[PDB]
Design a protein around this nucleic acid. Structure first.
Lengths: 226, 85, 251, 544
DNA sequence: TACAGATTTTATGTTTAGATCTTTTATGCTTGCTTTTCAAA
DNA sequence: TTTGAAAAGCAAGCATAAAAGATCTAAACATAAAATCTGTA
């Protein structure tokens, strides 16, 4: 790439390569530590992008060449479809794992009461520790289906609430097969036992992007608890 | 507030893995190297629960504590006041 | 009775998980319940199971026998049948798959053997059942290359039957009847994988029943593809006097 | 007894078409034969094109895998939406053995087993292509000394979203050690169904940096640009054209049901189309007249149910307000060119305009409902053909006997039922399932499961089973139980137990324990304690 | 009678699937004191 | 418009269910030398 660049646009090229290696070291030594291999990988990834920004003005000027390619030294850059029912079941699983069942009726209940009775009052306090930083809790299937039906998007013979049909359980089975959700047991698992409990198996950064793909406001359910 | 570059969470993962590899953290309640090949074989035919959860939820314990860090980090290091609690 | 406001949907789910105070909890056990021996339980149970509501069950069974040609037409097109409902579906599947299905298939292809599985029995095994499938269908035995390195011989043999049977004529060589597909040993992952790969084979007819209300959680998209179910509700409020002997009722 | 076994073979003692007689048992048997045969020509014509489409899917996917595979690091291919069934094939290239090694999570309990299975497959393939060895990576080291040829290894990791990621990471680090041998090149194929970032955050960052040197991505899933769905549905439109038309509600049913399935929505589409065709040829007696040579087979029943059409209603109401068999047999010649128009606008849409990311089922639905213009007002490149591509559907007369429509709720009971909702509704409204014909007892008392469910539905967290049994007793009547239990003098044990003063409570306890363990088998109820058996927890709620 | 080859017997190694028991941690009921929202003055 | 009062909430205590895993064991899968059988020459 350098041999094509110098004809398209030994000691001076050696100084150019050495200055690039020193710039890589001072940009990413805090990230890599004293690791020769990681710095070698960063040098390999960022050398052709550095060579591509070399002009006849930048070649004999180190500060100008660094200013032309400063974005190579600001980010490490060490990096490399799913259904609506399965997305909303993941959101309901995350809610079930990271919220207490006793405060469910204070959050999702919206029906007019023919019979007299007070609803849940809600929680008085705010938690000191973010629950999303800790391990997820274990829930039952019926709670997950209840919250899934409460958060799924919508006369005399319509019944606009979506009931738990074959497709909901089938998407839940794929959700466990991918281990986007998990159980206490993983080998010889009895799906039908009531003692078997379920938990979510995705972090917050995945469930946030999934909820952005469906325009659900999941951060509203954690802004007023801690 | 009283300028150190604040690294993102996607970049501290590499530093965290380097710290785990350099025996500064250990996995919580980990046996480690077994005494004999039979127990090691039994452990190799079992998948532990720590290796199935995401890396940011794995429980660790410290090989060095904060008092030792205060003892052997120099006074002129600019992270020193954080060694007291 | 609950002092609730709602009964249905999550409205009755969240509303019925009240934190009941310990002063309003009754300390009632089976100590003041009537003392009943085993034999009188059996006698009263069989008397109402053979006399109570018998005429509506007989009539309702006379309606749902008219669905047998539709079931046969579904079976010839490659669909597995799964039956579900409230009550025992043992006698229905026996009568349909023995009195009706096997003679009709045998006469249309010019009897057909009928393996009958009892998933209510906790000692139902996949290796014994597959040895009998080998005894009935005589598949070709796996080569050394087909055994790989400590692979499951049952699954590899069924996959070899799958890519053998794709070019055979599509005529039903076996009717395979599954009572209670969601019982204790039959709901496990390997046995369901075995029957899914058997259900890929067009030349085997699959008739199954389920009893658990959460039973469709057993099947992911691949297994649902392989089963290829047409669902049919047969609710009849039968005794279920055969499956009940496989659980302990006196406890 | 056979009831106490696990499995048993029965050969029934034997002493031809599953179609039945329609028109209240007045359809002739020749019409039954014609319905069976004509259903089979339509079914065979559909599935021949379905089979060619499926082989084209595997052929094109194999071609693009071979292209991405052959044009000191791994060659990594990330196959998104894989749902792995592909039989990958490699080149027969001289002086280099090309070995495909497939690994599943079942074959991967640890790194040692993965290496042992990989080296056994490698030695087996290299012996079959042309003394025993150790099944470790030194076989890769001495491959040229044992077989005289270079080594190209392609690893197919099946179902990476099920494999243990620490084990896979350590196996990749193990495979990195073979890069010091000049005769070895390694390809890795990762079959992904979740996301790339999901596996990116379950692997260590050094492995991610290792895989970043040479990696490619490729989408595998059946909803890649809709072109494999759009063929299959058009194949149905190449089968049913001039014979039946699709209803708009049936097409939006197809759209909603395919939007609910990720990995396998092509076979679900084929299953729904097949079951609709089965339902039509099993239900309607007019499907003999799809063949245009049966028009002499009209009878009084055919014309009697022919006149009950809303289109014929509107037509004769218009002709009465203005001022039968020959009118029917001449009006069966029109072609209904909506299918040809849909194929024409599809070939116009990727002919020159280069618009290929469309669903033909969405296009056909909007063409059926007359809102086609709102459908192609989205791409903002076909503004110049709002009158070239405009179509107005024509509501023809008596087309409602020749149609595929979803209004009886048969598809949503047979293919996608509300299973647990059906179970709890048959439990609670049982009079619906059971006929309303022990003459004096069946009118008064419900079946024990239904009464027990109605008392079960109206309860709290924890049900005390003794008080619940008392609540079950108070629903039962004592008098006609004691009358009906004495209505069989053959069994004297029943009479002497009826003579006991605690007969009614005992019989109610028989029925209650039987029904409670019926609910415990079905999963509705749960004993939270292994011992005691004094309390229960409800598991399931109606209408969720 | 005998003998080359196929099958059995006895003997052991390899890998997977499941049971049992122990230890430490979540959980569920109890009890006492504090808030609080909706059925009557 | 208030009122208050029973429903809801919070925290300590503590017995107990359960998750995790250490240890092991049976069962499928696999190989092998010596003896025994077996079908002919």
């Amino acid at each position: 790439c350098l041999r094509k660049r110098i004809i398209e646009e030994d000691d001076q090229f050696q100084n150019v390569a050495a200055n690039f290696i020193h710039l890589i070291v001072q940009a990413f030594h805090s990230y890599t530590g004293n690791d020769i291999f990681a710095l070698n990988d960063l040098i390999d990834f960022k050398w052709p992008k550095y060579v591509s920004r070399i002009t006849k003005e930048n070649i004999f000027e180190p500060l100008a060449l660094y200013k032309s390619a400063i974005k190579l030294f600001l980010s490490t850059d060490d990096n490399l479809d799913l259904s609506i029912i399965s997305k909303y079941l993941l959101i309901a699983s995350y809610i079930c794992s990271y919220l207490e069942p006793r405060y469910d009726a204070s959050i999702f209940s919206r029906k007019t009461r023919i019979i007299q009775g007070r609803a849940a009052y809600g929680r008085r306090k705010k938690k000191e520790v973010n629950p999303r930083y800790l391990q997820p809790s274990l829930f039952a299937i019926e709670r997950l289906l209840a919250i899934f039906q409460a958060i799924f998007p919508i006369a005399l013979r319509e019944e606009s609430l979506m009931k738990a049909n074959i497709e909901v359980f089938q998407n839940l089975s794929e959700l466990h097969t991918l281990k986007l959700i998990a159980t206490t047991m993983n080998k010889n698992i009895d799906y039908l036992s009531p003692k078997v409990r379920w938990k979510v198996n995705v972090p917050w950064e995945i469930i946030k992007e999934i909820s952005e793909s469906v325009h659900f406001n999941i951060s509203d359910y954690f802004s007023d608890i801690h | 507030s009283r300028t150190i570059k604040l690294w993102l969470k996607k970049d501290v993962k590499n530093v965290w893995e380097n710290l785990v590899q350099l025996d500064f953290f250990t996995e919580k309640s980990a046996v480690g190297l077994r005494d004999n090949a039979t127990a090691a074989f039994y452990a190799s035919n079992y998948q532990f629960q720590g290796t199935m959860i995401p890396f940011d939820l794995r429980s660790y314990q410290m090989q060095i504590i904060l008092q030792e860090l205060r003892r052997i980090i120099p006074k002129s290091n600019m992270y020193y006041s954080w060694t007291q609690l | 009775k609950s002092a609730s406001s709602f009964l249905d949907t999550f409205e009755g789910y969240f509303d019925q998980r009240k934190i009941v105070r310990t002063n309003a909890k009754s300390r009632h056990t089976m100590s003041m319940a009537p003392d009943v021996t085993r034999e009188e339980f059996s006698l009263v149970s069989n008397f109402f199971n053979e006399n109570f509501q018998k005429r509506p069950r007989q009539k309702l069974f006379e309606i749902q026998k008219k669905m047998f040609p539709q079931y046969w037409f579904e079976l010839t097109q490659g669909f597995s049948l799964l039956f579900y409902g409230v009550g025992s579906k043992r006698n229905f599947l026996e009568e349909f798959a023995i009195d009706y299905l096997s003679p009709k298939i045998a006469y249309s292809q010019l009897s057909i053997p009928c393996l009958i599985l009892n998933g209510y029995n906790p000692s139902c095994n996949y290796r014994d059942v597959f040895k009998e499938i080998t005894d009935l269908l005589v598949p070709a035995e796996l080569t050394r290359s087909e055994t790989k390195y400590w692979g499951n011989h049952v699954i590899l043999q069924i996959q070899k039957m799958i890519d053998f049977y794709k070019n055979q004529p599509l005529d039903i060589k076996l009717i395979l009847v599954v009572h209670n597909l969601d019982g204790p040993s039959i709901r496990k992952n390997t046995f369901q994988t075995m029957l899914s790969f058997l259900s890929v084979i067009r030349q085997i007819a699959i008739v199954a029943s389920t009893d658990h209300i959460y039973a469709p959680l057993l099947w992911d998209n691949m297994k649902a593809q392989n089963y290829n179910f047409v669902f049919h509700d047969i609710s009849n409020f039968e005794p279920s006097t055969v499956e009940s002997t496989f659980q302990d009722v006196m406890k | 007894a056979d009831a106490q076994r696990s499995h048993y073979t029965v050969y029934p003692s034997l002493p031809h078409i599953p179609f039945v007689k329609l028109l209240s048992g007045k359809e002739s048997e020749v019409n039954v034969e014609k319905r069976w045969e004509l259903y089979h020509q339509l079914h065979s014509h559909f599935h021949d094109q379905v089979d060619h489409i499926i082989d084209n899917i595997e052929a094109d996917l194999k071609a693009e895998i071979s292209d991405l595979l052959y044009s000191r690091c791994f060659n990594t291919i990330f196959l998104l939406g894989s749902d792995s069934t592909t039989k990958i094939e490699l080149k027969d290239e001289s002086s280099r053995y090309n070995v495909l090694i497939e690994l599943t999570p079942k074959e991967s309990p640890n790194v040692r087993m993965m290496l042992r299975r990989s080296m056994y497959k490698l030695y087996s393939a290299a012996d079959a292509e042309e003394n025993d060895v150790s099944y470790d990576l030194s076989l890769v080291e001495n491959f040229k000394r044992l077989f005289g040829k270079d080594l190209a290894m392609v690893f197919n990791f099946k179902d990476v979203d099920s494999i243990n990621f620490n084990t896979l990471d350590n196996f990749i680090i193990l495979l990195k050690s073979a890069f010091k041998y000049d005769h070895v090149k390694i390809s890795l194929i990762f079959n992904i169904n979740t996301n790339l970032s999901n596996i990116e955050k379950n692997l260590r960052q050094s492995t991610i940096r290792l895989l970043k040197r040479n990696y490619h991505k490729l989408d595998v899933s059946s909803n890649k640009g809709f072109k494999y769905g759009n063929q299959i549905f058009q194949s149905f439109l190449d089968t049913v054209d001039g014979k039946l038309n699709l209803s708009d509600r049936f097409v939006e049913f197809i759209l909603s049901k395919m939007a609910n399935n990720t990995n396998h929505n092509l076979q679900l589409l084929t299953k729904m189309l097949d079951y609709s065709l089965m339902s039509y040829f099993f239900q309607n007696a007019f499907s003999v007249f799809i063949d245009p040579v049966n028009v002499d087979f009209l009878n009084d029943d055919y014309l009697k149910i022919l006149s009950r059409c809303p289109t014929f209603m509107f037509f004769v109401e218009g002709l009465i307000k203005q001022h039968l068999e020959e009118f029917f047999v001449e009006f069966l010649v029109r072609e209904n060119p909506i299918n040809g128009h849909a194929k024409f606008v599809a070939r116009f849409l990727e002919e020159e305009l280069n618009i290929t990311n469309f669903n033909l089922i969405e296009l056909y639905h909007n063409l059926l409902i007359g809102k086609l213009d709102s459908y192609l007002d989205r791409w903002s490149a076909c503004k110049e053909y709002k009158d070239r591509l405009h179509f107005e559907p024509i509501d023809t007369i008596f087309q409602e006997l020749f149609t595929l429509d979803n209004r009886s709720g048969l598809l949503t009971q047979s293919i996608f039922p509300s299973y647990k909702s059906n179970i709890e509704d048959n439990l609670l409204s049982w009079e619906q399932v059971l006929p309303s014909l022990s003459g004096d007892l069946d009118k008064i008392m419900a079946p024990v499961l239904g009464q027990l469910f109605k008392l079960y539905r109206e309860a709290n967290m924890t049900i005390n089973i003794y008080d619940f049994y008392i609540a079950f007793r108070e629903t039962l009547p004592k008098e006609e139980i004691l009358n009906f239990i004495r209505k069989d003098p053959s069994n004297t044990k029943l009479l002497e137990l009826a003579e006991t003063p605690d007969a009614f409570d005992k019989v109610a306890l028989i029925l209650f324990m039987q029904a409670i363990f019926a609910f415990e088998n079905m999963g509705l109820i749960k004993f939270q304690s292994t011992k005691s058996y004094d309390l229960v927890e409800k598991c399931v709620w109606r209408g969720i």
